[PDB]
Amino acid sequence: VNIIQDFIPVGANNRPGYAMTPLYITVHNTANTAVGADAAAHARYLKNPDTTTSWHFTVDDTEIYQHLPLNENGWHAGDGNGSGNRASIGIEICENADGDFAKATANAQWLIKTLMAEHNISLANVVPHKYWSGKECPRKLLDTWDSFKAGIG
Numbered sequence: 001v002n003i004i005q006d007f008i009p010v011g012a013n014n015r016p017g018y019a020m021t022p023l024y025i026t027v028h029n030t031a032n033t034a035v036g037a038d039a040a041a042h043a044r045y046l047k048n049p050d051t052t053t054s055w056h057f058t059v060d061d062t063e064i065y066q067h068l069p070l071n072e073n074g075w076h077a078g079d080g081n082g083s084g085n086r087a088s089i090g091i092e093i094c095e096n097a098d099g100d101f102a103k104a105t106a107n108a109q110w111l112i113k114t115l116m117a118e119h120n121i122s123l124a125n126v127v128p129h130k131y132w133s134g135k136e137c138p139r140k141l142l143d144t145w146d147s148f149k150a151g152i153g
């Protein structure tokens with residue numbers, strides 16, 4: 001799958017820029033079913049000066065956009081300065097109506113497998129946003145989380 005880099009500008013409110021050596025991979029679901037709410041759209045949204053949340057990769061059924069370098073943290077896990085925000089790579093999976101969720105999930109599993117090998121991160125350390133904050137996210141993968149992970153391998 002193609003990865004397009006379009007970083008949030010340095011110094012922005014949602015680009016804290018703390019050095020990070022990722023030990024985890026945190027999975028999210030955008031909860032945005034609107035037609036057109038794809039990876040490129042999120043890339044554009046994240047660059048708005050007033051946004052405060054941020055993660056590393058947004059995945060849709062066609063491509064993947066990277067908003068942050070992997071040596072920097074993002075604000076997405078909701079655990080302050082805990083490992084979610086300060087020691088994990090955040091990934092968002094789109095739910096846009098004009099996209100195939102099954103194929104977006106497959107693309108995300110490919111990305112996660114690649115990240116695991118390149119950053120020496122174990123499958124056990126691939127966690128849902130919920131793990132860090134108890135929030136019901138990734139809403140479409142929670143009830144079948146273990147299966148989603150079995151599909152990574």
Ligand SMILES: [Cl-]
Binds near residue numbers: 076129137
């Ligand atoms: Cl979230």
Ligand SMILES: [Zn+2]
Binds near residue numbers: 027028029076129137
């Ligand atoms: Zn989340």
